[PDB]
Design an enzyme around this catalytic site. Structure first.
Site, short mmCIF file in Angstrom:
data_model
loop_
_atom_site.label_atom_id
_atom_site.label_comp_id
_atom_site.label_asym_id
_atom_site.label_seq_id
_atom_site.Cartn_x
_atom_site.Cartn_y
_atom_site.Cartn_z
N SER A 46 0.60 -1.18 -0.11
CA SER A 46 0.00 -0.06 -0.09
C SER A 46 0.67 1.30 0.02
CB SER A 46 -1.03 0.06 1.21
OG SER A 46 -2.02 -0.93 1.13
N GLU A 145 -3.39 -7.49 -7.06
CA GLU A 145 -2.52 -8.22 -7.42
C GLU A 145 -1.41 -7.97 -6.95
OE1 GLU A 145 -3.01 -6.26 -11.82
OE2 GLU A 145 -2.63 -8.60 -11.89
C1 LIG Z 1 -2.29 -2.35 1.49
O1 LIG Z 1 -1.03 -2.49 1.60
N1 LIG Z 1 -3.20 -2.77 1.93
C2 LIG Z 1 -4.62 -2.17 1.92
C3 LIG Z 1 -4.79 -2.12 3.49
N2 LIG Z 1 -4.34 -1.05 4.14
O2 LIG Z 1 -2.96 -1.57 4.57
S1 LIG Z 1 -2.17 -0.71 5.48
O3 LIG Z 1 -2.83 -0.46 6.88
O4 LIG Z 1 -1.99 0.59 4.72
O5 LIG Z 1 -1.00 -1.49 5.62
C4 LIG Z 1 -4.68 -3.30 4.25
C5 LIG Z 1 -4.16 -4.58 3.53
C6 LIG Z 1 -3.45 -4.17 2.38
C7 LIG Z 1 -3.93 -5.09 1.10
O6 LIG Z 1 -4.93 -4.89 0.82
N3 LIG Z 1 -3.22 -6.24 0.90
N4 LIG Z 1 -3.54 -7.39 0.81
C8 LIG Z 1 -4.72 -7.94 1.31
O7 LIG Z 1 -5.00 -7.32 2.39
C9 LIG Z 1 -5.40 -9.42 0.91
C10 LIG Z 1 -6.53 -9.68 1.78
C11 LIG Z 1 -6.62 -11.16 2.01
C12 LIG Z 1 -5.21 -11.87 2.80
N5 LIG Z 1 -4.06 -10.94 2.34
C13 LIG Z 1 -4.15 -10.22 1.26
#
Ligand SMILES: *C(=O)N1C[C@H](NOS(=O)(=O)O)CC[C@H]1C(=O)NNC(=O)[C@@H]1CCCNC1
Length: 267
Positions: A46, A145
């Site tokens: 992210s 992805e």
């Molecule tokens: C970003 O890295 N994201 C979006 C979200 N906010 O992240 S953070 O608080 O900024 O670190 C949290 C997760 C992450 C993201 O979407 N990555 N992948 C997933 O969450 C998938 C969901 C199911 C299992 N893991 C992969």
């Protein structure tokens, strides 16, 4: 002396965590730096969304976009982890509001929409970072992805040093005018997702702006931050981690402690 001990501490941390820790920290006053695995590649997750917001702001400042431009998306099945866009759908959202949502809540609907309509895809995001002199950053895929965090996969990676340098240019250098810079900084200051990371390593009275990433695979997680100590000049801290196996969990604590170690190294 302190740079030596620090490298020692990060190494121990890294063994305790069973993974890889990349650090780069800048004290923008003394010009002092500290680096451990600082030119190694780590997945962005992210964290690029912080750089995404600056790209929109740059367009805004060149008056190719208006920050108050309504963006409609009512027909779109929103991606996972789109908290803000889910609660705005059917009413439109200003361009600036979408960007800050991407940054401060890591909203994947916001991120994807911006890249599809305004920024020319991952290639466009990469173009932007080259334009500010970042030669390491690359974004190859879309949300979600891009969070695969496969070891040895170079897609969607940067280096801790490159991230820190670029953060310094955008939040502290001369890429944005006074006005738009302050907007960008306020967005960073209002990030809601980093309380257990870099933020947890500093005096409560210091102002921090930060952007996190957590891929959710290979225990990959990160944080980068501008820190405003009082009576002292801004710091830049860039903390990136990955782990050995797919199933391994990420560690917030490790990032906080690595942050703390980095900061002491640049007194
Ligand atoms: C970003 O890295 N994201 C979006 C979200 N906010 O992240 S953070 O608080 O900024 O670190 C949290 C997760 C992450 C993201 O979407 N990555 N992948 C997933 O969450 C998938 C969901 C199911 C299992 N893991 C992969």
């Amino acid at each position: 002396n302190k740079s030596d001990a620090a490298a020692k501490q990060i190494k121990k941390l890294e063994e305790d965590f069973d993974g890889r820790i990349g650090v780069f920290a800048i004290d923008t006053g003394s010009g002092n730096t500290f680096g451990y695995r600082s030119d190694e590649r780590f997945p962005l997750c992210s964290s690029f969304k912080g750089f995404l917001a600056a790209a929109v702001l740059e367009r805004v400042q060149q008056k190719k976009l208006d920050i108050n431009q309504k963006v409609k998306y009512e027909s779109r099945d929103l991606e996972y982890h789109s908290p803000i866009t889910t609660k705005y759908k059917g009413s439109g959202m200003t361009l600036g509001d979408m960007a800050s949502a991407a940054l401060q809540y890591s909203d994947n609907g916001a991120t994807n929409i911006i890249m599809e309509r305004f920024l020319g895809g991952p290639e466009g995001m990469t173009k932007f970072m080259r334009s500010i002199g970042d030669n390491e950053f690359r974004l190859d895929r879309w949300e979600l992805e891009l969070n695969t965090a496969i070891p040895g996969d170079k897609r969607d990676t940067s280096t801790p040093k490159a991230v820190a340098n670029s953060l310094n240019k955008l939040a502290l250098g001369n890429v944005l005018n006074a006005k738009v810079k302050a907007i960008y900084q306020n967005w960073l200051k209002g990030n809601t997702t980093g309380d257990a990371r870099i933020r947890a390593s500093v005096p409560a009275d210091w102002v921090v702006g930060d952007k996190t990433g957590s891929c959710g695979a290979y225990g990959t997680a990160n944080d980068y931050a501008v820190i405003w100590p009082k009576n002292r000049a801004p710091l830049i801290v860039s903390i990136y981690t990955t782990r050995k196996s797919k199933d391994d969990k990420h560690s917030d604590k490790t990032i906080a402690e690595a942050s703390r170690i980095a900061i002491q190294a640049i007194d």
